[PDB]
């Protein structure tokens, strides 16, 4: 025993590695694909189902299933296959000589924590494990002890206010609008230009359109007047069949849904009011140190111009006598993992593991009373 | 002129009727809903906004706003719509030939009473009006002149000690934890079983889960051991789509928040210590007659086992040489209206109305020197 | 006309009745209470002010005023209300067909006797009246014509020597230390145990602590050593809220102030030296008959052990060749009333009344040339 | 040995330092706060409980307790923590090489002095100590030997008359209305403007509103007519969350409760009649020197206009032939400490200490026969 495993099994992308590093080694999407066609040439390298990157590169013949829906592991058979591909097939590591540090989103079902610990204690047989919380590791990568997090991953966004290491769990605002729901809205409004993107392998292409051509408008109704003079707004993208598409106001009208969720028919508020309603629900004393520390994390905070849109809109809600400081690090896509690798590298942490001999005599219901 | 109107505009339910009756005629929720969708079939009975019961049955397409937050009327445009729906559209009564008796919670802002009187004196043009206090009408329905009230409505709970018709305003203990804050905590902990109830049309469903399946545990830490042997505790409820939910220890863990407000993260005491601190702040003579008369009122005192839990916990605080007598009538959900209907039916009361010719020469500031 | 009224309006208690009986009918405290709180339920048995026992059982919401301070009637509006409650509301008697026999303490202001007679001759319109002296009716209840009285009521204590029915007015020793000044000292030293008794309804409780648990130590500095071995001295009393209080050397240190008035900061001598200096201001031949007749009266002589303490301390002052005989009846709390009912029942007395036709032609200044 | 410690452990603020100085060094509130939230990041500077200023600055996550209620130490575990924070963590001094001079209010329980001496003689092990009286050091800072003090701290107010170094302890008038009871009334009447200040960390904000915007009205009913023309009376205050609040006639209605305690429902009189009743209970030959020397002390006498209101209201009680002279020094907030630092600097005082070898052979009951 020298080091520990840090697995940030997100809903859209698995980020794993070793503790003590700075960048994760195994970064691959959490996709399981079964082939949906006949396969006349039986043999010669054909498997029952593909996982990770090899299900991404063979995706014309596959139907691609994500096992994690909204931070919630729905298909426990495919999730066990992703962890099997994570340990053996990309870290080349034995599970039995490394403690693991899983994460999860807050406000998940309790059955999600119980089954992750049970799989790690007879399917892989880790020595000890620990299920952290994704948003408090985002501060702890940032070198802070106080701030509100906007951890906008692929399945869920969730605010967590921390003041000096103390979580305020009544002010956690979990929302169910993230990079899956922006992708599935971007497919819906690429139809009006003509492009029918229907399959589950075509949502892997619209996800790549979104990661290249989408930005956040600083003023939305002003940019909707710029598309009337449709000149410099349009850019192009070459599909995997060599076709080019043209995309106009759909570049910014897709990440506007983070700030006006009524485009996809949600009765909730944007991420500017969900952050502001997670500060008003805190105590009146700590609102200086929460307005001055807004930490973004996860991949959906990587649109160009989103740290300038939140600061333009929280300022319109917070009173004008104090500064709003959106803090977006450049590596904020991997920031949950980096804080996990820092956490498992501490010396004040090794009493906080959940060892197997402490597990089995106390049952898998132990993991809830060890977190929050 | 024969009779008077009695309107208990609560924060969660409007209860109105005529003076001298025994049960209110119009009992409808104080909800204003605007439609959040498009409405392609323009015409054929479509209005801009729905109030009351018709905003409850059509709530799938509406965003529902309660205009009374914590006993404080915030949206004066929509509170005017509920009174308009109260008089014309459910009592079928003209306002101009009936003096009305509004109520309110104690320790409200003074701007709340000034606007309720101003709206009644040019929007509806009532002859006279009177704004009572909700907790002293709860004794006066009970046929008492002495007692401490626990009027636990939908927005605010407040102790009001009355000794022999003399109010002790330095001992009124207003608290901000009631049936909204129990609903919003029950939505938070149904999530740990899996059920994401997010919209404002879904807090109308969790409010009905609370009114059917939640009880108060007599011993909370004993009932948490019963949920370990999870046998006779779980009951099922059928959603309006047809799904079933299996609520477990969330049945009693929701009304525990009345007795331990730190679950929703409040720095205030439970309703057993708020009652006992509202008696210690009284004079040492009258504590015989306040321990012997604990009157519950309002809707949030209707959980099965709350009159047995308050008596079990005030006894742990009060000295053991005297009896604690929680007095809970079966009609205590309507007990504020009944005492108001008795009060407007008295003969020693018709000089206490605030007539319009007395209003307009003195102004809207007259209403404060006519109460307490 | 058959019988006469006898009203011993003390400073702390009104004792009234008819002449010729042996016990007074109306024994109620001379308290007038106005309600200090608000009064939300206007009616149903609410009055501007309460007197006597109904101001005692409702005293949690009242500010209680004694209108007789140190034997001197200071509030003539409230004293008129105690007499009105005395005649109509507790004797059920008309004033106009009964001559009344008021009393008073000696050495009072002359304006006190004038106003008592002026009120009785137009407010109540009694036929005739007579203002006696309280201490000379204490011998006359005891069946003596020679003695020295220690009439220790609630406002004033005063020695009155009488030899053979001849009062010696130059040896009357009025002192201003009585049951109010012991109550207000007992409140001051119940604070050192922790108990804060502040209001004028809490002095109605400390007065009842004094009437149950206070005694007179035979040797004071010997009993202060018993409080060092704090074993059998302490007793417990139960408040009306149910809190038991512990009380040790405050039991006897409260009636020590009668014997050492420097505890409440008086430049006067105790009741043993006031009695002895009231005897050595008399003639040398009658001192054998005043030492052998020490009649006690008033309520503050009812502490257990005060006849044993006065006899132990006058003997330390009187010469050893002559005996001291403290005479304390069991009904000496009522002894001023009993002697007044004997006096009004005599046949050698009916020319001593002050009739109204003798009043009005001679003025209000007649009552002074009829007593002493 | 060169110098001595002077600790004025008040109810709302600890004022300590060394003898012989002119201003105290360690001024910090006597607050012990425990964290009430979860604490995810265990380590990195987290403690079980915070004291003093660090419990004030981190107060959003704390529940703040004052250990001294009404001059009475009600939590001996936390009071021991404030003395420990005083000696080591803000004076940086050893207890064992400095005699200390504690103070207390008059008329405290006897158990309060015994436990303060017991803690100083085994927990900190001082050489010698001395418990003074807070009001008699307020004269002795002022350079007087004759005067009456109105020492109005944070827990209690109390008058102490002194004529030429002789305390008149039967005229000491302790009251239980001070800067806590004015803060808790100011929270009650800030609610009628709309502001709910509920938590014990929000009473630390209302205490800072009181120290800025409150003044004593010279004529109360005249200023209540000024609030009808609500023009020059309102001022604004910026909360820690940057919300400005507007405050009108609550600026003077809060310190009016010092002069009319029936606003918070007390059966006591204001500080002008308590001072006047403390002078009339003294001897008639010294009332000229007490009317001419009214010394104020403690922080609650620092409202603008309180020396002009006492002089306006004692003059309406005292007879017109003798002058009233309210003497308020500008450093009267620290005046109890300054007179204590003078007292421990005298040469006629070193026989008045209570040394440990005098303590242990005589017991903890020695401290009471060494004062007054
Ligand atoms: N450069 C980018 N710009 C915009 N969105 C991105 C970018 N990169 C990734 N995303 C979105 O963020 C998601 C990945 O975020 P991540 O933090 O991995 O979420 P999770 O960890 O929950 O899987 C992807 O599904 C994608 O939709
Ligand atoms: N039978 C019940 N059991 C439990 N809770 C109830 C019941 N009836 C109503 N409630 C709760 O109490 C609230 C109604 O209280 P109510 O008396 O209407 O308050 P108000 O009239 O002051 O608004 C509802 O919001 C609901 O959450
Ligand atoms: N049994 C008792 N023991 C001790 N003190 C008593 C007792 N009864 C009455 N007192 C005190 O004496 C007072 C009553 O004396 P009382 O004869 O009524 O005087 P007066 O009639 O002149 O007012 C009461 O105020 C009470 O303090
Ligand atoms: N400048 C000020 N104006 C008005 N009130 C003040 C001011 N400063 C302090 N106070 C009040 O006085 C109290 C402090 O008085 P202090 O002398 O510290 O009392 P103690 O020392 O007995 O605790 C505080 O609680 C505060 O409410
Ligand atoms: C369940 C949980 O929230 N664990 C958790 C998350 C994050 C975090 C960051 C930094 C820490 C430092 C020291 C100790 C711990 C312990 C748990 C923990 C953390 C830390
Ligand atoms: C402002 C207010 O509290 N009014 C009020 C409340 C309740 C109540 C009950 C019974 C009453 C009987 C007679 C008169 C009044 C007057 C006001 C009033 C009441 C009553
Ligand atoms: C003023 C006065 O002291 N009158 C008084 C008191 C007591 C007393 C007792 C017995 C008496 C017998 C006969 C006559 C009188 C007259 C006055 C009188 C008394 C008597
Ligand atoms: C218990 C007590 O009141 N001690 C006390 C207070 C104040 C004071 C002032 C000045 C003094 C001068 C000389 C001696 C003493 C002794 C005690 C004392 C004082 C003084
Ligand atoms: Mg993630
Ligand atoms: Mg109600
Ligand atoms: Mg008497
Ligand atoms: Mg002080």
Author numbering:
A (entry chain A), B (entry chain B), C (entry chain D), D (entry chain C): 4 to 375
The article reads:
Actin, one of the most abundant proteins in all eukaryotic cells, can polymerize into long filaments, one of the three major types of filaments that make up the cytoskeleton.
These small differences indicate that the longitudinal interface between the B and P subunits may be less well ordered in Mg-ADP-pyrenyl-actin filaments than Mg-ADP-Pi-pyrenyl-actin filaments and might contribute to the difference in pyrene fluorescence.
